[PDB]
């Protein structure tokens, strides 16, 4: 039978990651611009916990240098955990999404896209077994669990955008390393 070339695998993955990230950004920007003034944004970012996302239980790289030091398997693993951590919490963004003027922004669509991307990363990890010993707190740990509404919605939305950015970014790094020619 035919085997999907790794390149088409990566491209579909990137289409999903990107769409999720774009949806997060657009709804986030939209919420902020209408309900959150700089004042509260600043307060939020320095408030106890608040600026802390549930998904931070997962050790992820924070800069180029560190990201680039991770093996392909770890980067995919990390991205998997990040996706999985949102399968449940998105339900909470339902009210935000219902009032959003963003197409595709719904708890159901967002959930399906997360599920499809999850199958994608799982598919990739099965192909990209490249040295990296399946040992470490990354391979020995699960996704993160979630616990004024406005702020709660705002923090949920602020973290969604951020985690989707990590995913799109992490997958890209692996793409350029594996799929020669997709970047340069």
């Amino acid at each position: 039978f035919p085997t999907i070339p790794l390149s088409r695998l990566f491209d579909n993955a990137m289409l999903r990651a990107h769409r999720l990230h774009q949806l997060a950004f657009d709804t986030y920007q939209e919420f902020e611009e209408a309900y959150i003034p700089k004042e509260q944004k600043y307060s939020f970012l320095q408030n106890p916990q608040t600026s802390l996302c549930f998904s931070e239980s997962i050790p992820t790289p924070s800069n180029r240098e560190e990201t680039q030091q991770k093996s392909n398997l770890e980067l995919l693993r990390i991205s998997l955990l990040l996706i999985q951590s949102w399968l449940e919490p998105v339900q909470f963004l339902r009210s935000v999404f219902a009032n959003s003027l963003v197409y595709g922004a719904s708890d159901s669509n967002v959930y399906d896209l997360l599920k499809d991307l999850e199958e994608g990363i799982q598919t990739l990890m099965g192909r990209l077994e490249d040295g990296s010993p399946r040992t470490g707190q990354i391979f020995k740990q699960t996704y993160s669990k979630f616990d004024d509404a406005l702020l709660k919605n705002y923090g949920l939305l602020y973290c969604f955008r951020k985690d989707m950015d990590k995913v799109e970014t992490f997958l890209r790094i692996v793409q350029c390393r594996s799929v020669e020619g997709s970047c340069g």
């Binding site: 035919p2 088409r8 579909n12 289409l15 774009q22 595709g104 399906d112 499809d116 994608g120």
Partner: protein
């Protein structure tokens, strides 16, 4: 023997297979256990429809047409291979300007992506190919694939009627769908 016509995915989210001519269809998502067609009706006679719940872009499928228990046809493929877009819609054209001689004109052809693309925002890409020719001509003149929904056609002769048709394809995947309705370009005589 009843054989396969084709399987085609219109938007990389679902697909369906059709055959000719008691025929049954069995599939497997060979990442033997065949499961039968989840729907024989939605797509009409001699077809099996696989909605978004049965379609995965990540794994290859295999189907076998079983005429009276016996297998009469078999094929394996990935959804990516059977993608084949719906033709573009709402073809229109604009008159840019006619030369000084009054012999040639420069027009602009415009269209809209098929409705099932706008839905699949970010999932379907699409590059279109426009072809044109004098009504009473045999060959079709072809323009190279573009990602935009507007392109200009230059050097047409005012003293002739032309026809234009365009088809879409997913960016480097699947194959070209079917042509749009032909747009007939008639260039007016200028004073």
């Amino acid at each position: 023997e009843p054989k396969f016509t084709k399987c085609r995915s219109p938007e990389r989210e679902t697909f369906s297979c059709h055959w000719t001519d008691p025929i049954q269809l069995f599939y497997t998502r060979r990442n033997q256990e065949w499961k039968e067609c989840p729907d024989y009706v939605s797509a009409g006679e001699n077809s099996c429809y696989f909605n978004s719940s049965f379609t995965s872009i990540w794994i290859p499928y295999c189907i076998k047409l079983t005429s009276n228990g016996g297998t009469v046809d078999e094929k394996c493929f990935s959804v990516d291979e059977i993608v084949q877009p719906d033709p573009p819609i709402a073809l229109n054209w604009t008159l840019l300007n006619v030369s000084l001689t009054g012999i040639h004109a420069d027009i602009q052809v415009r269209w809209e992506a098929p409705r099932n693309a706008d839905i699949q925002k970010g999932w379907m890409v699409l590059e279109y190919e426009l072809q044109y020719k004098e009504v009473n001509e045999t060959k079709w003149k072809m323009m190279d694939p573009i990602l935009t929904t507007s392109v200009p056609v230059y050097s047409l002769k005012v003293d002739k009627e032309y026809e234009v048709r365009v088809r879409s394809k997913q960016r480097n995947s699947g194959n070209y769908g079917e042509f749009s309705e032909v747009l007939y370009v008639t260039l007016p005589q200028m004073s």
